[PDB]
Structure 1
C-alpha cells in the first residue's frame, strides 16, 4: 500500500556493486522537488534532487554533503519527471558510480565521492511524491 514520506530505507551493511534499488511512486500535482539521499551517518554520499522550478526551469541537482557542507553540484537538464505522473527510479550501484535510470531510460551517473561504500547504510526518500514501493535486490 502507500508508504509514508519521508521514508527511510535501511541498506544493511551498506551498498555494494550490483545492488539495484527500485523506487516506484507518483509525482504530486504542482510538485517542487524530489530527493533521494544515500546517507553515511550524517553525511550524504549521494543526493539526487529533481527540482521542478528552479528559476522557472526543471533541473536535476546531484551533490554530496560532508561534515554538514555541500560540495560542488552536478546538474543534469534532462528531466524525465512530470507533475502528476507515475515514475520508476532505478539506482544501480557500480564499482565507480551510481547509475540512475528513470522509466527504464538511462539518466545519469554519479562518481563515488564517499568511498566507504559499506558505510552507506540508509536511503532517505522525500519530497512531493506519493511513494508506492522502495526495495532492493542484487543483479
Structure 2
C-alpha cells in the first residue's frame, strides 16, 4: 500500500524515483507548511542536473503570497511552458497536508487531504520521469509510492 518510504528528508530534496510512473501509480507526500513559507514546489523531473537544469515534466508549486495559489507548468530546455494557475488552494501556513499525485493515462490528478485539487495534462510522457525534487519552504514528513 506504500513502498520506498523516505522520512524527514532535508529540503531541498532530490531523489531517484524507484519504479516507473505508469497509470494508476500514486505519489504520496505528507508535510507541513512553515509559518514563514513563501512557496514550495514538487517537481517530477527527467534527471537531476542543476546546470543546465533538468527538464520538469510536472512542476506543482503552491505559493502563499497574496491570496495564495498553485502554479503548475513544465520546464523543457530551461524554458517554462504555459502556466496553469489554480486559485483555490488547500495549503495554508502552519498547516499539515497529505498530497496524493495520481498518475492517469492522460493527466495527473492531485488531491490534498482527500479532496480534489487540480488536474494537469501530460505534456511529456510520465514514463520518462525518474526524479522527484522538493524545493522551497516546506517540511516533509514522508514520501511514499504505490506503483500500478
TM-score normalised by length of structure 2: 0.87
Report how far residue 2 of structure 1 moved. Answer: 2.5
Report how far residue 78 of structure 1 moved. Answer: 0.6
Match for 2:134 among 120, 125, 131? 125
- Look up the match of 1:21: 27
Q: Quick check: which one's strand share is greater?
A: 1
* Equivalent runs, 1:1-139 vs 2, <5 Å: 2-41=8-47, 42-53=54-65, 56-115=66-125, 117-138=126-147
Instruction: Give the 3-state SS of the residue equivalent to 2:64 in structure 1.
Output: strand
CA–CA distance in structure 1, aligned partners of residues 144 and 18 of structure 2: 12
Compute the RMSD of aligned alpha carbons: 1.3
Aligned residues: 136
Query: Which structure 1 segments of 5+ residues have no match?
Result: none
1:38 and 1:46 in contact (8 A); partners too: yes
Runs of 4+ residues deviating >2 angstroms: none
Instruction: Give the 3-state SS of the residue equivalent to 1:16 in structure 2.
Output: coil
CA–CA distance in structure 1, aligned partners of residues 32 and 113 of structure 2: 12
Query: Which structure 2 segments of 5+ residues have no match?
Result: 1-6, 48-53
TM-score normalised by length of structure 1: 0.92
Report how far residue 21 of structure 1 moved. Answer: 0.6
Instruction: Give the 3-state SS of the residue equivalent to 1:118 in structure 2.
Output: helix
2:72 and 2:85 in contact (8 A); partners too: yes
